[PDB]
Amino acid sequence: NKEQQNAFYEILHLPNLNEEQRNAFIQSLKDDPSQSANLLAEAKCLNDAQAAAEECIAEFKEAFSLFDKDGDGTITTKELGTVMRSLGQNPTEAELQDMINEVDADGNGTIDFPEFLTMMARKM
Ligand SMILES: [Ca+2]
Ligand SMILES: [Ca+2]
Protein backbone atom coordinates (compact mmCIF):
# COMPACT_ATOMS: atom_id res chain seq x y z
CA ASN A 1 0.00 0.00 0.00
CA LYS A 2 2.60 2.53 -1.07
CA GLU A 3 2.71 2.79 -4.87
CA GLN A 4 -0.74 1.17 -4.90
CA GLN A 5 -2.00 4.24 -3.02
CA ASN A 6 -0.49 6.56 -5.58
CA ALA A 7 -2.20 4.83 -8.53
CA PHE A 8 -5.44 4.86 -6.59
CA TYR A 9 -5.31 8.61 -6.26
CA GLU A 10 -4.27 9.15 -9.86
CA ILE A 11 -7.29 7.22 -11.10
CA LEU A 12 -9.53 9.25 -8.84
CA HIS A 13 -8.41 12.38 -10.58
CA LEU A 14 -8.25 11.24 -14.20
CA PRO A 15 -10.58 13.93 -15.62
CA ASN A 16 -12.39 12.18 -18.46
CA LEU A 17 -13.54 9.00 -16.77
CA ASN A 18 -17.18 8.87 -15.77
CA GLU A 19 -17.93 7.89 -12.22
CA GLU A 20 -19.07 4.38 -13.20
CA GLN A 21 -15.69 3.87 -14.85
CA ARG A 22 -13.87 5.49 -11.92
CA ASN A 23 -15.77 3.12 -9.56
CA ALA A 24 -14.75 0.10 -11.62
CA PHE A 25 -10.99 0.59 -11.40
CA ILE A 26 -11.22 1.60 -7.76
CA GLN A 27 -13.03 -1.27 -6.06
CA SER A 28 -11.25 -3.71 -8.34
CA LEU A 29 -7.86 -2.39 -7.18
CA LYS A 30 -9.14 -2.86 -3.65
CA ASP A 31 -9.75 -6.61 -4.24
CA ASP A 32 -6.36 -6.96 -5.88
CA PRO A 33 -3.77 -4.20 -5.26
CA SER A 34 -1.06 -6.42 -6.72
CA GLN A 35 -2.60 -5.46 -10.07
CA SER A 36 -2.08 -1.72 -9.42
CA ALA A 37 0.19 -0.87 -12.40
CA ASN A 38 -2.17 -2.67 -14.81
CA LEU A 39 -5.41 -1.05 -13.77
CA LEU A 40 -3.77 2.40 -13.90
CA ALA A 41 -2.56 1.76 -17.44
CA GLU A 42 -5.97 0.62 -18.66
CA ALA A 43 -7.70 3.67 -17.13
CA LYS A 44 -4.97 5.98 -18.46
CA CYS A 45 -5.83 4.65 -21.96
CA LEU A 46 -9.55 4.91 -21.29
CA ASN A 47 -9.23 8.52 -20.16
CA ASP A 48 -6.90 9.89 -22.84
CA ALA A 49 -6.26 7.49 -25.77
CA GLN A 50 -4.14 10.07 -27.56
CA ALA A 51 -2.14 11.19 -24.52
CA ALA A 52 -1.70 7.68 -23.05
CA ALA A 53 -0.12 6.01 -26.11
CA GLU A 54 2.30 3.70 -24.26
CA GLU A 55 -0.45 2.42 -21.89
CA CYS A 56 -2.73 1.68 -24.87
CA ILE A 57 0.10 -0.09 -26.72
CA ALA A 58 0.74 -1.95 -23.47
CA GLU A 59 -2.72 -3.33 -23.13
CA PHE A 60 -2.99 -3.91 -26.89
CA LYS A 61 0.13 -6.09 -26.75
CA GLU A 62 -1.47 -8.39 -24.17
CA ALA A 63 -4.49 -8.59 -26.49
CA PHE A 64 -2.12 -9.60 -29.29
CA SER A 65 -0.44 -12.25 -27.17
CA LEU A 66 -3.88 -13.80 -26.63
CA PHE A 67 -4.21 -14.75 -30.33
CA ASP A 68 -0.52 -15.16 -30.97
CA LYS A 69 -0.25 -18.19 -28.69
CA ASP A 70 3.09 -19.55 -29.99
CA GLY A 71 4.34 -15.98 -29.83
CA ASP A 72 6.07 -15.70 -33.23
CA GLY A 73 4.92 -12.06 -33.28
CA THR A 74 2.25 -13.01 -35.80
CA ILE A 75 -1.39 -14.14 -35.90
CA THR A 76 -1.85 -17.04 -38.31
CA THR A 77 -5.21 -18.05 -39.78
CA LYS A 78 -5.02 -21.15 -37.52
CA GLU A 79 -4.45 -19.17 -34.30
CA LEU A 80 -7.51 -17.09 -35.17
CA GLY A 81 -9.50 -20.29 -35.57
CA THR A 82 -7.98 -21.86 -32.46
CA VAL A 83 -9.04 -18.89 -30.33
CA MET A 84 -12.50 -18.49 -31.87
CA ARG A 85 -13.61 -22.15 -31.61
CA SER A 86 -12.45 -22.05 -27.98
CA LEU A 87 -15.09 -19.29 -27.71
CA GLY A 88 -17.82 -21.61 -29.02
CA GLN A 89 -17.91 -20.04 -32.52
CA ASN A 90 -17.80 -22.21 -35.64
CA PRO A 91 -16.25 -20.42 -38.62
CA THR A 92 -15.80 -21.93 -42.05
CA GLU A 93 -12.11 -21.89 -42.93
CA ALA A 94 -13.01 -19.43 -45.72
CA GLU A 95 -14.17 -16.75 -43.25
CA LEU A 96 -11.01 -17.12 -41.20
CA GLN A 97 -9.25 -16.29 -44.47
CA ASP A 98 -11.54 -13.32 -45.16
CA MET A 99 -11.04 -12.05 -41.59
CA ILE A 100 -7.24 -12.02 -41.83
CA ASN A 101 -7.34 -10.57 -45.41
CA GLU A 102 -9.44 -7.64 -44.18
CA VAL A 103 -6.70 -6.32 -41.88
CA ASP A 104 -3.54 -7.47 -43.71
CA ALA A 105 -1.46 -4.59 -45.02
CA ASP A 106 1.52 -6.21 -46.73
CA GLY A 107 -0.79 -8.98 -47.95
CA ASN A 108 1.33 -11.84 -46.62
CA GLY A 109 -1.51 -13.92 -45.13
CA THR A 110 -0.81 -13.22 -41.47
CA ILE A 111 -1.16 -10.29 -39.09
CA ASP A 112 1.68 -8.33 -37.43
CA PHE A 113 1.41 -6.06 -34.40
CA PRO A 114 1.36 -2.87 -36.56
CA GLU A 115 -1.52 -4.26 -38.62
CA PHE A 116 -3.21 -5.24 -35.39
CA LEU A 117 -2.86 -1.65 -34.19
CA THR A 118 -4.54 -0.29 -37.29
CA MET A 119 -7.60 -2.53 -36.88
CA MET A 120 -8.06 -1.33 -33.33
CA ALA A 121 -7.65 2.29 -34.37
CA ARG A 122 -10.23 1.95 -37.13
CA LYS A 123 -13.55 1.49 -35.34
CA MET A 124 -13.65 4.28 -32.77
CA1 LIG B 1 1.72 -17.05 -34.02
CA1 LIG C 1 0.84 -9.05 -42.52
Short mmCIF file of all heavy atoms in Angstrom, two decimals, residues 92-123:
data_model
loop_
_atom_site.label_atom_id
_atom_site.label_comp_id
_atom_site.label_asym_id
_atom_site.label_seq_id
_atom_site.Cartn_x
_atom_site.Cartn_y
_atom_site.Cartn_z
N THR A 92 -16.34 -21.24 -40.89
CA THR A 92 -15.80 -21.93 -42.05
C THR A 92 -14.40 -21.38 -42.29
O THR A 92 -14.13 -20.20 -42.03
CB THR A 92 -16.65 -21.74 -43.33
OG1 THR A 92 -16.54 -20.39 -43.81
CG2 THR A 92 -18.12 -22.12 -43.08
N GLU A 93 -13.51 -22.24 -42.78
CA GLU A 93 -12.11 -21.89 -42.93
C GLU A 93 -11.94 -20.77 -43.97
O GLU A 93 -10.90 -20.11 -44.03
CB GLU A 93 -11.28 -23.14 -43.29
CG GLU A 93 -9.85 -23.16 -42.72
CD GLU A 93 -9.77 -23.49 -41.23
OE1 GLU A 93 -10.69 -24.15 -40.71
OE2 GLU A 93 -8.78 -23.09 -40.58
N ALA A 94 -12.99 -20.52 -44.74
CA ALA A 94 -13.01 -19.43 -45.72
C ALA A 94 -13.32 -18.06 -45.11
O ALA A 94 -13.06 -17.05 -45.75
CB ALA A 94 -14.01 -19.74 -46.82
N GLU A 95 -13.90 -18.03 -43.91
CA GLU A 95 -14.17 -16.75 -43.25
C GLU A 95 -12.97 -16.34 -42.42
O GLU A 95 -12.70 -15.15 -42.25
CB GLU A 95 -15.41 -16.83 -42.38
CG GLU A 95 -16.61 -17.35 -43.12
CD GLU A 95 -17.75 -17.67 -42.19
OE1 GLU A 95 -17.47 -17.97 -41.01
OE2 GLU A 95 -18.92 -17.61 -42.64
N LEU A 96 -12.28 -17.34 -41.88
CA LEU A 96 -11.01 -17.12 -41.20
C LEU A 96 -10.04 -16.43 -42.16
O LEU A 96 -9.32 -15.51 -41.78
CB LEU A 96 -10.46 -18.45 -40.70
CG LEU A 96 -11.32 -19.08 -39.60
CD1 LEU A 96 -10.77 -20.45 -39.14
CD2 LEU A 96 -11.43 -18.11 -38.44
N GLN A 97 -10.05 -16.88 -43.41
CA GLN A 97 -9.25 -16.29 -44.47
C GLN A 97 -9.71 -14.88 -44.80
O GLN A 97 -8.89 -14.00 -45.02
CB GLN A 97 -9.31 -17.18 -45.72
CG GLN A 97 -8.42 -16.71 -46.86
CD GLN A 97 -6.96 -16.56 -46.44
OE1 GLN A 97 -6.34 -17.52 -45.99
NE2 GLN A 97 -6.43 -15.36 -46.58
N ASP A 98 -11.02 -14.66 -44.85
CA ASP A 98 -11.54 -13.32 -45.16
C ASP A 98 -11.28 -12.37 -44.00
O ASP A 98 -11.02 -11.18 -44.22
CB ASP A 98 -13.04 -13.36 -45.48
CG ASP A 98 -13.34 -14.05 -46.79
OD1 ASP A 98 -12.39 -14.35 -47.55
OD2 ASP A 98 -14.55 -14.30 -47.06
N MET A 99 -11.32 -12.88 -42.77
CA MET A 99 -11.04 -12.05 -41.59
C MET A 99 -9.58 -11.60 -41.52
O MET A 99 -9.33 -10.46 -41.19
CB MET A 99 -11.41 -12.78 -40.31
CG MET A 99 -12.89 -12.88 -40.08
SD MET A 99 -13.30 -14.39 -39.20
CE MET A 99 -12.53 -14.01 -37.65
N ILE A 100 -8.62 -12.48 -41.80
CA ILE A 100 -7.24 -12.02 -41.83
C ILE A 100 -7.05 -11.04 -43.00
O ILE A 100 -6.49 -9.96 -42.80
CB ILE A 100 -6.20 -13.20 -41.93
CG1 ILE A 100 -6.50 -14.13 -43.10
CG2 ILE A 100 -6.13 -14.00 -40.63
CD1 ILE A 100 -5.50 -15.25 -43.26
N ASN A 101 -7.56 -11.38 -44.20
CA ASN A 101 -7.34 -10.57 -45.41
C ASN A 101 -7.82 -9.12 -45.30
O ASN A 101 -7.41 -8.25 -46.09
CB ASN A 101 -8.02 -11.21 -46.63
CG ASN A 101 -7.28 -12.43 -47.14
OD1 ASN A 101 -6.44 -13.00 -46.44
ND2 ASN A 101 -7.60 -12.84 -48.37
N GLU A 102 -8.69 -8.88 -44.32
CA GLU A 102 -9.44 -7.64 -44.18
C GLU A 102 -8.65 -6.65 -43.32
O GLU A 102 -8.94 -5.46 -43.30
CB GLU A 102 -10.83 -7.96 -43.60
CG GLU A 102 -11.50 -6.93 -42.69
CD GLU A 102 -12.75 -7.48 -42.00
OE1 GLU A 102 -13.83 -7.46 -42.64
OE2 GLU A 102 -12.65 -7.94 -40.84
N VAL A 103 -7.61 -7.16 -42.66
CA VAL A 103 -6.70 -6.32 -41.88
C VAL A 103 -5.21 -6.57 -42.18
O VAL A 103 -4.35 -6.22 -41.38
CB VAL A 103 -6.93 -6.50 -40.37
CG1 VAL A 103 -8.16 -5.73 -39.94
CG2 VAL A 103 -7.10 -7.96 -40.04
N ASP A 104 -4.92 -7.17 -43.33
CA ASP A 104 -3.54 -7.47 -43.71
C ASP A 104 -3.00 -6.44 -44.70
O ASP A 104 -3.42 -6.37 -45.85
CB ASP A 104 -3.44 -8.89 -44.29
CG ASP A 104 -1.99 -9.33 -44.55
OD1 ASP A 104 -1.03 -8.72 -43.98
OD2 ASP A 104 -1.81 -10.30 -45.31
N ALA A 105 -2.07 -5.62 -44.21
CA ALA A 105 -1.46 -4.59 -45.02
C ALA A 105 -0.62 -5.21 -46.12
O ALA A 105 -1.05 -5.29 -47.28
CB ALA A 105 -0.60 -3.67 -44.15
N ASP A 106 0.56 -5.71 -45.76
CA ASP A 106 1.52 -6.21 -46.73
C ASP A 106 1.06 -7.47 -47.46
O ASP A 106 1.85 -8.08 -48.18
CB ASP A 106 2.88 -6.45 -46.06
CG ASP A 106 2.79 -7.33 -44.82
OD1 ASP A 106 1.86 -8.17 -44.75
OD2 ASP A 106 3.65 -7.19 -43.93
N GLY A 107 -0.20 -7.85 -47.26
CA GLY A 107 -0.79 -8.98 -47.95
C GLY A 107 0.03 -10.26 -47.92
O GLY A 107 0.20 -10.91 -48.95
N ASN A 108 0.54 -10.62 -46.74
CA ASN A 108 1.33 -11.84 -46.62
C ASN A 108 0.60 -12.98 -45.89
O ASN A 108 1.20 -13.99 -45.54
CB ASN A 108 2.67 -11.52 -45.92
CG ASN A 108 2.52 -11.15 -44.45
OD1 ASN A 108 1.42 -11.15 -43.89
ND2 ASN A 108 3.65 -10.85 -43.80
N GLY A 109 -0.70 -12.82 -45.65
CA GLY A 109 -1.51 -13.92 -45.13
C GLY A 109 -1.58 -14.04 -43.61
O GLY A 109 -2.35 -14.84 -43.07
N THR A 110 -0.75 -13.27 -42.92
CA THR A 110 -0.81 -13.22 -41.47
C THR A 110 -0.99 -11.79 -40.98
O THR A 110 -1.20 -10.87 -41.78
CB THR A 110 0.44 -13.82 -40.83
OG1 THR A 110 1.56 -12.96 -41.06
CG2 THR A 110 0.75 -15.20 -41.40
N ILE A 111 -0.90 -11.60 -39.67
CA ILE A 111 -1.16 -10.29 -39.09
C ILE A 111 -0.11 -9.92 -38.06
O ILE A 111 0.02 -10.60 -37.04
CB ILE A 111 -2.54 -10.25 -38.46
CG1 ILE A 111 -3.60 -10.42 -39.55
CG2 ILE A 111 -2.78 -8.94 -37.73
CD1 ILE A 111 -4.96 -10.78 -39.02
N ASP A 112 0.65 -8.85 -38.34
CA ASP A 112 1.68 -8.33 -37.43
C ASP A 112 1.11 -7.30 -36.46
O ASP A 112 -0.01 -6.81 -36.63
CB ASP A 112 2.85 -7.72 -38.23
CG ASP A 112 2.40 -6.70 -39.27
OD1 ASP A 112 1.44 -5.96 -39.01
OD2 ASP A 112 3.01 -6.64 -40.36
N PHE A 113 1.89 -6.96 -35.44
CA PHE A 113 1.41 -6.06 -34.40
C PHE A 113 1.02 -4.68 -34.94
O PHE A 113 -0.01 -4.14 -34.51
CB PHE A 113 2.47 -5.92 -33.31
CG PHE A 113 2.01 -5.15 -32.12
CD1 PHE A 113 0.85 -5.52 -31.44
CD2 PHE A 113 2.74 -4.07 -31.66
CE1 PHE A 113 0.42 -4.82 -30.32
CE2 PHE A 113 2.32 -3.35 -30.54
CZ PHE A 113 1.15 -3.72 -29.87
N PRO A 114 1.81 -4.10 -35.89
CA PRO A 114 1.36 -2.87 -36.56
C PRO A 114 0.00 -2.98 -37.25
O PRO A 114 -0.84 -2.09 -37.11
CB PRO A 114 2.47 -2.61 -37.58
CG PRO A 114 3.67 -3.17 -36.95
CD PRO A 114 3.21 -4.41 -36.23
N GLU A 115 -0.21 -4.06 -37.99
CA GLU A 115 -1.52 -4.26 -38.62
C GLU A 115 -2.59 -4.37 -37.56
O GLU A 115 -3.69 -3.85 -37.72
CB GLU A 115 -1.54 -5.50 -39.51
CG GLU A 115 -0.93 -5.26 -40.88
CD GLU A 115 -0.35 -6.52 -41.47
OE1 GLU A 115 -0.57 -7.59 -40.87
OE2 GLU A 115 0.31 -6.44 -42.53
N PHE A 116 -2.26 -5.06 -36.47
CA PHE A 116 -3.21 -5.24 -35.39
C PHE A 116 -3.63 -3.87 -34.84
O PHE A 116 -4.82 -3.59 -34.64
CB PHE A 116 -2.62 -6.13 -34.29
CG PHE A 116 -3.57 -6.43 -33.16
CD1 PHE A 116 -4.86 -6.87 -33.41
CD2 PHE A 116 -3.17 -6.27 -31.83
CE1 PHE A 116 -5.73 -7.13 -32.37
CE2 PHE A 116 -4.04 -6.54 -30.79
CZ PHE A 116 -5.32 -6.97 -31.05
N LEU A 117 -2.63 -3.02 -34.63
CA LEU A 117 -2.86 -1.65 -34.19
C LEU A 117 -3.85 -0.87 -35.07
O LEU A 117 -4.69 -0.12 -34.58
CB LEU A 117 -1.54 -0.89 -34.17
CG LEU A 117 -0.60 -1.20 -33.03
CD1 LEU A 117 0.51 -0.15 -32.97
CD2 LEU A 117 -1.37 -1.29 -31.72
N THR A 118 -3.71 -1.04 -36.37
CA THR A 118 -4.54 -0.29 -37.29
C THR A 118 -6.01 -0.70 -37.14
O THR A 118 -6.89 0.16 -37.08
CB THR A 118 -4.06 -0.51 -38.73
OG1 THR A 118 -2.63 -0.50 -38.73
CG2 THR A 118 -4.61 0.57 -39.65
N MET A 119 -6.25 -2.00 -37.03
CA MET A 119 -7.60 -2.53 -36.88
C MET A 119 -8.28 -1.98 -35.63
O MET A 119 -9.46 -1.65 -35.65
CB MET A 119 -7.57 -4.06 -36.81
CG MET A 119 -8.94 -4.70 -36.61
SD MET A 119 -8.88 -6.36 -35.91
CE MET A 119 -7.33 -6.98 -36.58
N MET A 120 -7.52 -1.90 -34.55
CA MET A 120 -8.06 -1.33 -33.33
C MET A 120 -8.40 0.14 -33.49
O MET A 120 -9.45 0.61 -33.05
CB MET A 120 -7.07 -1.53 -32.19
CG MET A 120 -6.80 -3.01 -31.87
SD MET A 120 -8.25 -3.94 -31.28
CE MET A 120 -8.85 -4.68 -32.79
N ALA A 121 -7.49 0.86 -34.14
CA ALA A 121 -7.65 2.29 -34.37
C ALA A 121 -8.92 2.58 -35.15
O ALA A 121 -9.61 3.57 -34.88
CB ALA A 121 -6.45 2.83 -35.11
N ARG A 122 -9.24 1.68 -36.08
CA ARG A 122 -10.23 1.95 -37.13
C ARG A 122 -11.63 2.25 -36.59
O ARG A 122 -12.12 3.37 -36.74
CB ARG A 122 -10.28 0.78 -38.11
CG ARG A 122 -9.39 0.96 -39.34
CD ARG A 122 -10.20 0.86 -40.63
NE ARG A 122 -9.44 1.22 -41.83
CZ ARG A 122 -9.18 2.47 -42.21
NH1 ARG A 122 -9.62 3.49 -41.47
NH2 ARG A 122 -8.49 2.71 -43.31
N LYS A 123 -12.27 1.24 -36.00
CA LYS A 123 -13.55 1.49 -35.34
C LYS A 123 -13.23 2.20 -34.02
O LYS A 123 -12.29 1.82 -33.32
CB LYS A 123 -14.34 0.19 -35.13
CG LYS A 123 -15.85 0.39 -35.23
CD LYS A 123 -16.55 -0.78 -35.92
CE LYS A 123 -16.62 -2.00 -35.03
NZ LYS A 123 -17.39 -1.72 -33.79
#
